[PDB]
Amino acid sequence: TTFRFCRDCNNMLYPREDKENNRLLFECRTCSYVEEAGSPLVYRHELITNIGETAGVVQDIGSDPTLPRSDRECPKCHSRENVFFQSQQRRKDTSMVLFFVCLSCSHIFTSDQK
């Protein structure tokens, strides 16, 4: 789904079809470089998504003092310290699932059990 660029000239490649050999050949519209396509996938709309509650993590989230602190442990390092905080996505139907990030194992883990 990514947008490849011509390695000779950093420009947006377009799909264009072979006339007889029946293969998608990503030909550069700037220069004459051409490349065959790995998959027949071209375009993808994705009218439904549910993604974005997790990321935005820096390696020193816990360096900020404003996050609360708890005593549930990380289930890799068993250290009782932790930093917990809710979703990073904000829609009107995002969940009250929680995200728990530790300093020792430096790992992200949740509290869902379905």
Partner 1 sequence: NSDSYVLLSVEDDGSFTMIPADKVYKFTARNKYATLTIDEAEKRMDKKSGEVPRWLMKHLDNIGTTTTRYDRT
Partner 2 sequence: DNDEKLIIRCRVVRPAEEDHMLKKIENTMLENITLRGVENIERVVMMK
In angstroms, the CA 96 to CA 111 distance is 10
Helix or strand (DSSP H, E) at 108 = strand 108-110
Candidates 5, 24, 25, 33; binder of Zn ion (CB under 5 A) is 33
Given 1, 40, 43, 96, the residue binding partner 2 (CB under 8 A):
43
Choose among partner 2, Zn ion, partner 1, none what residue 42 binds, the Cβ cut-off being 5 to 8 Å by kind: partner 2
Shortest distance (Å) from residue 34 CB to partner 1: 11
17 three-class SS: strand
CB closer to partner 2 out of 19 and 90: 19
Helix (H) or strand (E) holding 36: strand 34-36
